[PDB]
Amino acid sequence: ALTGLTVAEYFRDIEGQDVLLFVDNIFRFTQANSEVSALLGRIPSAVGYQPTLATDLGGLQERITTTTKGSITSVQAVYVPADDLTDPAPATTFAHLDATTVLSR
Amino acid sequence: ILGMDELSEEDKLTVARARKIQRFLSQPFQVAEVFTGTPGKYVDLADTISGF
Amino acid sequence: SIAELGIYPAVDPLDSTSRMLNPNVIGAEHYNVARGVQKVLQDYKNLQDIIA
Amino acid sequence: EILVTGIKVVDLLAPYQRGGKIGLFGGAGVGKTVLIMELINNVAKAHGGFSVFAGVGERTREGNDLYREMIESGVIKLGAERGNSKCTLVYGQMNEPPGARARVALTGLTVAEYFRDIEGQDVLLFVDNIFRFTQANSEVSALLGRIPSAVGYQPTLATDLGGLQERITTTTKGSITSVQAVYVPADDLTDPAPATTFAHLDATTVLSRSIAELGIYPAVDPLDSTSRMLNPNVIGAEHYNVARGVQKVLQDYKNLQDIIAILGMDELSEEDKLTVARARKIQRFLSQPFQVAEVFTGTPGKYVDLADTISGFQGVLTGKYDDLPEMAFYMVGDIKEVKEKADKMAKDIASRKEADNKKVSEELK
Amino acid sequence: EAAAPAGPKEFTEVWNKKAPSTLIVPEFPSNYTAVKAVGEGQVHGDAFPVNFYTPHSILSQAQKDTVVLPGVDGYFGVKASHVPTIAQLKPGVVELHSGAESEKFFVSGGFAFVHPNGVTDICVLEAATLDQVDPAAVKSALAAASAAQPTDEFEQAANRAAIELYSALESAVEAKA
Amino acid sequence: SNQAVKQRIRAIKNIGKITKAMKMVAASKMKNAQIAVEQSRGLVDPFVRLFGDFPAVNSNKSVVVAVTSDKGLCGGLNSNITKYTRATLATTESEGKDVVVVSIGDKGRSQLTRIESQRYQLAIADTYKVRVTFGQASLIVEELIKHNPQSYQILFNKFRSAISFKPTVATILSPDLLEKQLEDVTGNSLDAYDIEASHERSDVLRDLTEFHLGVTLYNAMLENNCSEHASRMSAMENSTKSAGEMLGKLTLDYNRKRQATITTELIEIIAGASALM
Amino acid sequence: DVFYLHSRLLERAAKLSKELGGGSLTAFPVIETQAGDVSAYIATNVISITDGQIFLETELFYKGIRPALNVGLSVSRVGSAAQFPGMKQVAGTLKLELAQYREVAAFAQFGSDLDAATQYVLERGARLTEMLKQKQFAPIPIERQTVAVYAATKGFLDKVRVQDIVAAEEAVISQVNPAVFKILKANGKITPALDAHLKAELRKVKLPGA
Amino acid sequence: LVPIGRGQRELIIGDRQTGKTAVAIDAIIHQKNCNEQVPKAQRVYCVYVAVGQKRSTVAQLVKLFTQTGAMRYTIMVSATASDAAPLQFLAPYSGCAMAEYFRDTGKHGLIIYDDLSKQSVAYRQMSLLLRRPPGREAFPGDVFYLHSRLLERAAKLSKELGGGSLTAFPVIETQAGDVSAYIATNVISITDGQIFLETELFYKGIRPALNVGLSVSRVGSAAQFPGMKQVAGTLKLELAQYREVAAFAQFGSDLDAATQYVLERGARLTEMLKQKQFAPI
Amino acid sequence: VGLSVSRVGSAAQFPGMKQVAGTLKLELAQYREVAAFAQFGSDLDAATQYVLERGARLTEMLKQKQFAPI
Numbered sequence A: 001a002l003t004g005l006t007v008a009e010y011f012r013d014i015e016g017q018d019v020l021l022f023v024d025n026i027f028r029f030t031q032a033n034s035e036v037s038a039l040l041g042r043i044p045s046a047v048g049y050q051p052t053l054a055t056d057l058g059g060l061q062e063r064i065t066t067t068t069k070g071s072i073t074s075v076q077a078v079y080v081p082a083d084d085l086t087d088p089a090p091a092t093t094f095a096h097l098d099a100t101t102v103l104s105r
Numbered sequence B: 001i002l003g004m005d006e007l008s009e010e011d012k013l014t015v016a017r018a019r020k021i022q023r024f025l026s027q028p029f030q031v032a033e034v035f036t037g038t039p040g041k042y043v044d045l046a047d048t049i050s051g052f
Numbered sequence C: 001s002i003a004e005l006g007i008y009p010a011v012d013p014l015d016s017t018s019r020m021l022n023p024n025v026i027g028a029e030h031y032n033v034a035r036g037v038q039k040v041l042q043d044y045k046n047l048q049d050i051i052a
Numbered sequence D: 001e002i003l004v005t006g007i008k009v010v011d012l013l014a015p016y017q018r019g020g021k022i023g024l025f026g027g028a029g030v031g032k033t034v035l036i037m038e039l040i041n042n043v044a045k046a047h048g049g050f051s052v053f054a055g056v057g058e059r060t061r062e063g064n065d066l067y068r069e070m071i072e073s074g075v076i077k078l079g080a081e082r083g084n085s086k087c088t089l090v091y092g093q094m095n096e097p098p099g100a101r102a103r104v105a106l107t108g109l110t111v112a113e114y115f116r117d118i119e120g121q122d123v124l125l126f127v128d129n130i131f132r133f134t135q136a137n138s139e140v141s142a143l144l145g146r147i148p149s150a151v152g153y154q155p156t157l158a159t160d161l162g163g164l165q166e167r168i169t170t171t172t173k174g175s176i177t178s179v180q181a182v183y184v185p186a187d188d189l190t191d192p193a194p195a196t197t198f199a200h201l202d203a204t205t206v207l208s209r210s211i212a213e214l215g216i217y218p219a220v221d222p223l224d225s226t227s228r229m230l231n232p233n234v235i236g237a238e239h240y241n242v243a244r245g246v247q248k249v250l251q252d253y254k255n256l257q258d259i260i261a262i263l264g265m266d267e268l269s270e271e272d273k274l275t276v277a278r279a280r281k282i283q284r285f286l287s288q289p290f291q292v293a294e295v296f297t298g299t300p301g302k303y304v305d306l307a308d309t310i311s312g313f314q315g316v317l318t319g320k321y322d323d324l325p326e327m328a329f330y331m332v333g334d335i336k337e338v339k340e341k342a343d344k345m346a347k348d349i350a351s352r353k354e355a356d357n358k359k360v361s362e363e364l365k
Numbered sequence E: 001e002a003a004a005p006a007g008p009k010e011f012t013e014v015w016n017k018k019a020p021s022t023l024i025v026p027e028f029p030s031n032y033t034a035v036k037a038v039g040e041g042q043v044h045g046d047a048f049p050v051n052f053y054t055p056h057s058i059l060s061q062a063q064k065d066t067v068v069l070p071g072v073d074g075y076f077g078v079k080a081s082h083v084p085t086i087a088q089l090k091p092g093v094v095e096l097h098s099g100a101e102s103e104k105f106f107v108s109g110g111f112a113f114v115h116p117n118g119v120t121d122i123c124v125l126e127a128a129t130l131d132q133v134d135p136a137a138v139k140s141a142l143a144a145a146s147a148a149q150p151t152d153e154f155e156q157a158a159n160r161a162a163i164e165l166y167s168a169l170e171s172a173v174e175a176k177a
Numbered sequence F: 001s002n003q004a005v006k007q008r009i010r011a012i013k014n015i016g017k018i019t020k021a022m023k024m025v026a027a028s029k030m031k032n033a034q035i036a037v038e039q040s041r042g043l044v045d046p047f048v049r050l051f052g053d054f055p056a057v058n059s060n061k062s063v064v065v066a067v068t069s070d071k072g073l074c075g076g077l078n079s080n081i082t083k084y085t086r087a088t089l090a091t092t093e094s095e096g097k098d099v100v101v102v103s104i105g106d107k108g109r110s111q112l113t114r115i116e117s118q119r120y121q122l123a124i125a126d127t128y129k130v131r132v133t134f135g136q137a138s139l140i141v142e143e144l145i146k147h148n149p150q151s152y153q154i155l156f157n158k159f160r161s162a163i164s165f166k167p168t169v170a171t172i173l174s175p176d177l178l179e180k181q182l183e184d185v186t187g188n189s190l191d192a193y194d195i196e197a198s199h200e201r202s203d204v205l206r207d208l209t210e211f212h213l214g215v216t217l218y219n220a221m222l223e224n225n226c227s228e229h230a231s232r233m234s235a236m237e238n239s240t241k242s243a244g245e246m247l248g249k250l251t252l253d254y255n256r257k258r259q260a261t262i263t264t265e266l267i268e269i270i271a272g273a274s275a276l277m
Numbered sequence G: 001d002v003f004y005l006h007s008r009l010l011e012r013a014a015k016l017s018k019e020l021g022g023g024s025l026t027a028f029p030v031i032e033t034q035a036g037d038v039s040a041y042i043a044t045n046v047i048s049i050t051d052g053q054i055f056l057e058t059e060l061f062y063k064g065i066r067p068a069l070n071v072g073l074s075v076s077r078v079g080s081a082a083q084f085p086g087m088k089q090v091a092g093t094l095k096l097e098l099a100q101y102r103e104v105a106a107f108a109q110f111g112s113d114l115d116a117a118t119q120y121v122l123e124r125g126a127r128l129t130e131m132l133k134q135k136q137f138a139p140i141p142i143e144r145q146t147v148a149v150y151a152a153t154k155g156f157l158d159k160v161r162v163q164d165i166v167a168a169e170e171a172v173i174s175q176v177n178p179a180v181f182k183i184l185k186a187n188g189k190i191t192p193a194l195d196a197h198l199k200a201e202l203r204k205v206k207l208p209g210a
Numbered sequence H: 001l002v003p004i005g006r007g008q009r010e011l012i013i014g015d016r017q018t019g020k021t022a023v024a025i026d027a028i029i030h031q032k033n034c035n036e037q038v039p040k041a042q043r044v045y046c047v048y049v050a051v052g053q054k055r056s057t058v059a060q061l062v063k064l065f066t067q068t069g070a071m072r073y074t075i076m077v078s079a080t081a082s083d084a085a086p087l088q089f090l091a092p093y094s095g096c097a098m099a100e101y102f103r104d105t106g107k108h109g110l111i112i113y114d115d116l117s118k119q120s121v122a123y124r125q126m127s128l129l130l131r132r133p134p135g136r137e138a139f140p141g142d143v144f145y146l147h148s149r150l151l152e153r154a155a156k157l158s159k160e161l162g163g164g165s166l167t168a169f170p171v172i173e174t175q176a177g178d179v180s181a182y183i184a185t186n187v188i189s190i191t192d193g194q195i196f197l198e199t200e201l202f203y204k205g206i207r208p209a210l211n212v213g214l215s216v217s218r219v220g221s222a223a224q225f226p227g228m229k230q231v232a233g234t235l236k237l238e239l240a241q242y243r244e245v246a247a248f249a250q251f252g253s254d255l256d257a258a259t260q261y262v263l264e265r266g267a268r269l270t271e272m273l274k275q276k277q278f279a280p281i
Numbered sequence I: 001v002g003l004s005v006s007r008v009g010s011a012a013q014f015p016g017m018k019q020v021a022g023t024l025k026l027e028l029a030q031y032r033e034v035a036a037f038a039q040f041g042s043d044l045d046a047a048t049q050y051v052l053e054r055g056a057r058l059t060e061m062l063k064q065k066q067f068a069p070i
């Protein structure tokens, strides 16, 4: 997802564009970063995520912004684990989110 | 539970107004026209507010 | 819950499972009685929500 | 022997022992500092002995409030009349590092133990948040290289607290009446720091959050507060049967609340409606205004004597006051005053307005 | 002879003195009917309002020009400004004419009031049209009712009611057009 | 303690579908009983314009009938007319008269005894089990004429719409025990009519007020039965909300316990691993 | 020591004594809550540290009542008996008429039966709730805030139903004489001279609900 | 309902202040009343082990046992809350060793371990400070073996070994009626019967607050009074019929008027099993 | 049937089965809210009944005996 940021940051900072970035399943970004903390021997936080969950997300989500050159807008898909909005992976994600688009059956 | 023509004419005025709002939120897409036939519609912002 | 009612042996008649409960092992007149008894006991548990 | 506190729910249901250990169990904002300042107001002036207030890990603003309000009460005298003071304060408040908060309860007892052992008299020890003793040792224990116990506490929680609480006793040479506030974390009474404290106390006054959200103050859970003084050979059979009868209708009302939420009161038997009518009445009657809460509630506080508590709740159990509405029982002193308040409620529903003019609002006078 | 000035309007004012003030007055069946008896009008010349009722149906409530009612003295007919009448009806045929077209209900008995404002209020229990009666089993039970008369004085009346009902039912299937 | 909270979500979810089934069971029973309560409304109209409407008469003997339900998820319908019973049973007594209190419906004997147990003498129940018919309402009326009062009081809930059920007192005077005695002012109000009966006018009015008793009783327990289904519908709507509000608080409480036991089992695993490493 | 993290921080917000200069520091910690659960760990830690709370309900925020102040749960006991003397006169009735409004709305929100006495409470309660909701980035002086609640706990607003009460407030605070805000500011409280002067100015304001 | 034979370990489990000590104290006080009437061979000598309690609570119990006269037969082994964690871990075993004197020499013992749940917390303290690696709720692995070692010493011996017996009463405190806890589930597996005491039954008036549907005696009626083996079997069944008919009339839906008879009689029977404290019958 | 999904979906359905199972899953979906009201048979709505009886016609259709695939 940082390789996706870097391609979208070139269009923002060099091309000067209004870029869309689709992070398909931002939860799987959280889930993968939670595995690499567990493999690096770090003590898991509350429910079982990495201790650096808010800075693993916030490191990615803060590069998606508007600068004076252009903009990156991110439409990122959100999975809610166990249909629990108070789970720390959506709750940390929803602090960054500026809109929700709920698609319904 | 009760019936369609049971409730008031103003509550039926919303039902007629909501159902043609609930329909009007639909839109054909330009990327979907290669398998749906209906051409795509880019709808501008002022035309969305004034249309609603 | 079977023991608290006084049925002894307190065997859960639905949760007890055997591999001898195939019709080609114990015959059809033992298999259909066992599957018939379990159907009436399962239906009663779906009605015991509304009886109580 | 009983310690009369002037509080209705305390003196009825979980009465305090005069040389015993008393714990007020609370969950962050339910009212165990207002209750412990009310016991300082009611008990500690008619006690006639020395008091020690050990403030362990609580607010420094509250340490300044108690200190200033004891100077204007004459409990603390400054200057050359210092020897006529009745209270000594030991403060280890919540800005202190965790070593100071882990030991300031011990230097509050040492002042209380000197008056018990050497001076040989009756002390009142008020320890605000003895949980903060346990929590400060739990901040330290991680760095002493210990394997942590259950929820995350020290392995030595029960013996650290046990070694402190066993010093706070009444001996054969003197007495310590100890009231301790016990914080419960995240409103969890099964948390091991509240759960270990329960065995160390003669009277536990458990303050609930749901009782406080119904506006009932003191927010005492009547079916979770317990004394060892609730014994018919200690308080008498008239007191004991009222307390057990009050608890019986409050318990049977709690058994009904699942149906009253779903089906409503229309589906109850009228035998059970008399339960819900009575148990809503005594639930309001257990609340009372405090003389330390008048400065923010406006209502003046009521000391209710024990004889007025017992007779008042006995009337509601026998049925002598089923006439009165359930809001007449709310925030009143004794059963004389629910009749004083029910008369006012009836009178108001008649006289509400007709204040147009010929009052002091003339534009020239 | 006028000891109790009752009524719906009087009951409201006195019930505010004995009941709680929370409760509003109970309703009354006078608050649900708009048609009265002594209230002047409601004839309109030729066709007069006929309220032919049962417990289980409202069989007519529009206006007719004549009603042949089967009274206990005999069949009488009602025109628009008829005399006020409380008529107990035999088992017989109520004929509702509107003009050239007429509908013929056979009723079991039950009163018919003509009110002073020209409103006819037929009030019977079972009002079968003769189209849904069969003429076979009427005498199959009438022959049985012509045979079984014991000394039961309660069945003295119930068999008498059995005979006179089928006998009028015999005679009123014969003359149909 | 994570299965006790999970089995309560078992309870409240089954209740919230029982009470939504009973909401629409009562909703379909409200509609097919509205087609019977509108047909029956006609026949009460001639007897209230022939005999009038006189609730407050000074009867010597009265029979008051509070017709209630049989099943009791009605929502305070059987209590509002038990409350409206004594509101009219204290009102119309100005002289110390006999009153026989009757209840139609099994939920009436359990609530009228709470107010008048010394005047409660009859209990009709099992009425609405198959249906309500006029022959059934006739037999209930003939048991009410065994006692002969001077007046009858019928207390029932008038089914106006699915929302409002304004209760009614419907009064029937005994044929000349008070009935002609209240019309005869400067003549008579009944003497306008030409009586076409077999026997006397005092004899046809004996026939005519029993028929007026059986009609307004048949309407009463048909107005009340359709008012019962429409208050059970509003009661079983208020309990599916209460079983959805409770289910929502339990699911928030379950998710908090679900998150807490995953943290607790993980801290137990890391502590056991750090004790070995 | 996550309690000591916050407790040693918020303890520095003090009012100093006069030999230390008399200076002060007032703190506003913000705690985000998950699904309204106030009994979480960090939330209950800061409740044990701070002097009061301002609970902001999600359900009142969705109804448009903004600021969504949960009145039954929001406390300030150190700041009460330190507030505006004019506001302390009029808000005792405001807290009470809202205390009855929550208590009466606890009994019957759906139309079982409506008393005339309780529909005075739902008429006055919805009056004061629309009174207290204000819009963002425009804070009101305390003298314009006392008058607006004086115009609501008393009469002067019962004509407007519930809808134009937001427009009745600038109908009140702009049409009264702006000297009446100067005397209320400089005295601090509502003197009986200013009391019936302000009754007089509130009878000659023209209200949008007519 | 839950009768206890000689040589049977029986758990008294419940929440705090539900009457678990009062059941245990009344067993000790009643043995004094029975020891004055029986021959010398069948007299029960009680041992009360008080683990982790207050010292004031223990001094109230030896005051009660001296006043009742029960102290003539009672040993009071006291490991209070200020004692070292190895003194509270070891006090059940030291009291059982004093109680096994009577079992081994043909006499009858009665050991009461008041809060075995406080012994396990003191054993967790030593295990975690000896750096043994923790398990469930930080308890050591061998905490089942901690209590099964102790409770299996309550035996009824052969007539070759004297015929003596030792009857154990472990006391376990639960947290919110949570018998699914780690130490509580260990001891329910060890002991024969179980006397479950409830909080909502306690405040309803039913005290001794015995949950009759959850309380077992695995010895059963083989070791109960024959004058109640024929009487209480009616009482066990009529209370079993009392329970479900009280769950439905909690709602107030309908009445059968033949299930109302079993709701009337069991309400006498529930009221029959109530008892005052410190007066064993 | 409410919880068993297939993200591939009906693009790998047998055609012919796709014609008739597309309305099978709909008639069973409407049946699932109408199910557990089937203990009210004496109390009926007659359009709720048609989805109730057809919903039981279809769950009885999908039963099979093992080791005999079709």
Ligand SMILES: Nc1ncnc2c1ncn2[C@@H]1O[C@H](COP(=O)(O)OP(=O)(O)OP(=O)(O)O)[C@@H](O)[C@H]1O
Binding pocket: D199, D227, D228, D229, D230, D231, H014, H015, H016, H017, H018, H019, H020, H021, H022, H023, H173, H207, H208, H275, H276, H277
């Ligand atoms: N059978 C009883 N009848 C009346 N009161 C009782 C009875 N049993 C206990 N009590 C009272 O209830 C209180 C709690 O009893 P007890 O001390 O025996 O509980 P416990 O289970 O030992 O609690 P803990 O050990 O947790 O303090 C005691 O004060 C006692 O006076």
Ligand SMILES: Nc1ncnc2c1ncn2[C@@H]1O[C@H](COP(=O)(O)OP(=O)(O)O)[C@@H](O)[C@H]1O
Binding pocket: D026, D027, D028, D029, D030, D031, D032, D033, D034, D035, D217, D218, D219, D290, D293, D297, G048, G075, G077
């Ligand atoms: N007896 C009481 N009467 C009125 N209000 C009370 C009472 N007890 C508590 N409160 C309210 O609840 C708050 C709890 O404060 P405090 O007693 O300091 O809580 P804690 O238990 O956390 O120390 C008080 O500020 C007060 O607003």
Ligand SMILES: [Mg+2]
Binding pocket: D032, D033, D058
């Ligand atoms: Mg405090």
Ligand SMILES: [Mg+2]
Binding pocket: H020, H021, H114
């Ligand atoms: Mg104990």
